[PDB]
Amino acid sequence: PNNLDSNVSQIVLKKFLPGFMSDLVLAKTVDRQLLAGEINSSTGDSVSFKRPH
Amino acid sequence: ILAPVRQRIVTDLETELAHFMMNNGALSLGSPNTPITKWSDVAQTASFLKDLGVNEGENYAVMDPWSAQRLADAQTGLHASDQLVRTAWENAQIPTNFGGIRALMSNGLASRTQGAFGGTLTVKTQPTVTYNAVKDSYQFTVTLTGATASVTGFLKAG
Amino acid sequence: SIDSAVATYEGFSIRVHKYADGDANVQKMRFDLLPAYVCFNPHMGGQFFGNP
Amino acid sequence: QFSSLRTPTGDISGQNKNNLISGKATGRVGNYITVAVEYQQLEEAIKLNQLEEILAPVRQRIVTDLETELAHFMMNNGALSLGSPNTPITKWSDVAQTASFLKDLGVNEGENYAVMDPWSAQRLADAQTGLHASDQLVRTAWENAQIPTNFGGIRALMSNGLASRTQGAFGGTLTVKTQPTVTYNAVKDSYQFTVTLTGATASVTGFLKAGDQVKFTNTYWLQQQTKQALYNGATPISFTATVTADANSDSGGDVTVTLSGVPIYDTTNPQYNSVSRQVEAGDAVSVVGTASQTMKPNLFYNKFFCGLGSIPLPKLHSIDSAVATYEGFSIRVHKYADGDANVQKMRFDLLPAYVCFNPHMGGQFFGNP
Ligand SMILES: [Cl-]
């Protein structure tokens, strides 16, 4: 009956396991050009575009 | 430790887009209890956009993993083009254009709950819908009558 | 009087602010983003299901 | 994993920031694997020729008994479940459901595998002889009864060495007796939890056996990143866990079992939830399959689910030895003898090691009724 357990360490290696993930689809198919850079500090919180006649 | 923080932001950006779009768009096709199975379940969306007059840019339909699969299962059953059945037998892929509309699979997609309604509903007062009232929004208030006695959350957003 | 930096992932920008707390000996960091939305025409989209 | 607040201004004053809660997975060393032989000096003289051929199969015994224990190890940990043992694999949509379930939960890294026995691979081979279009693809299965490398958008493999399991005799209608403590603090170092069950049959030895699968009807899997429940067509996908060891039903019909996979639902740290709600005392549950059935399960898993390793063994002193690898595993042999009984002894050894990184990345699958 040896007892050697105090000769050694409990080691946690420095690496992580793969987590889960999700995919981004809606984000990349809507219109992103029209509204870009259009709202700045001269404009207040909103801006408008024209409906066709 | 903090590397995941950025993709939490983006994940939560796009769960809002799902809700924003869901609370605005006025069009509806088919019954909400029934899952997408037939080819003509995706195809009805291209043709309704068409019949209504929309011509500009592309059109997208977006469904979950489980629907995408039953659609490939439908394509393993085609009788004619062997490049189109091989792809789905190996890969469970469907093509880029499907039904005459650009079709896409997304596991991030939001859900929503109906909210408890009952009774035979009618309008209480004729609303005012002319081009001059709704000109700037395309939204309008209407008051419905003949509902269940009193309920919190009788109709929920969406 | 608070220290910052800005990063890019997915073609979005995120500020980060690093402050602390004097009396509780504590360090705090927040990452934030402002989206904008537009609905051009409500009649051009919607929700679809199967036909039984 | 983190969560986020959504506010008109951005004022977070009265609210809760994310805590940091670490967790870890742990590997362990297993039993030795040993094959030992002996024979008299008299036999070495008159009776043993080609002794070197007499012990060729000895090293493949070692590696065979490694693969058989590995298969049990997996079958006992992975929580996921598809189909049910009463229906054999037939349709294309059987192998296919597994790849799209791994994607709906969000497994993105490495490669996914499905593994089945010869009888299953044959029923998938004549499903492939029925295709109406692809010319080559039917000819191959008609000739050779083979199926492609990728099948259903997962990578499919056949193996004749694979373990079986017996269900064990369960009956009556079951419900949970008390609330389990499932928060991320309790389960974060293991991913296992104990729960007591009610309404079982009076006194039964082996009421549930290691490898069974208990299903919680009203508690649903989430998507792990997005946190929205999972729907397959009309119906939600229930949560399911695996019985890790044998469990007996005491008189009065109670059963206390340890399960692998956890229905985490945490109020204080909701960012870690697995599932749509809190399992409460009085919830219906049921065991997948029929009472005393036996069978060989099919396994589907992500690459980082289980892992395997082996440990160099040092040399005993005053004894002679050498190392030889077969299938990329190193095996010691010690050759020693007993001077008084006049016999000769050889032993061949290997030490394995096993991790289960995540229980929620693998499981067992059957067909759909
Ligand atoms: Cl035909």
Automatic annotation (TrEMBL), chain C:
It comes from the Viruses. This is Gene 5 protein. It comes from Shigella phage Sf6.
From TrEMBL, chain D:
This is Gene 5 protein. Residues 1-19 are annotated as: Disordered. InterPro entries: Phage_coat_Gp5 (IPR024659). It comes from Shigella phage Sf6 (Shigella flexneri bacteriophage VI). The lineage of its organism: Viruses, Duplodnaviria, Heunggongvirae, Uroviricota, Caudoviricetes. Residues 1-19 have a biased composition (Polar residues). It holds the Pfam family P22_CoatProtein. It comes from the Viruses.
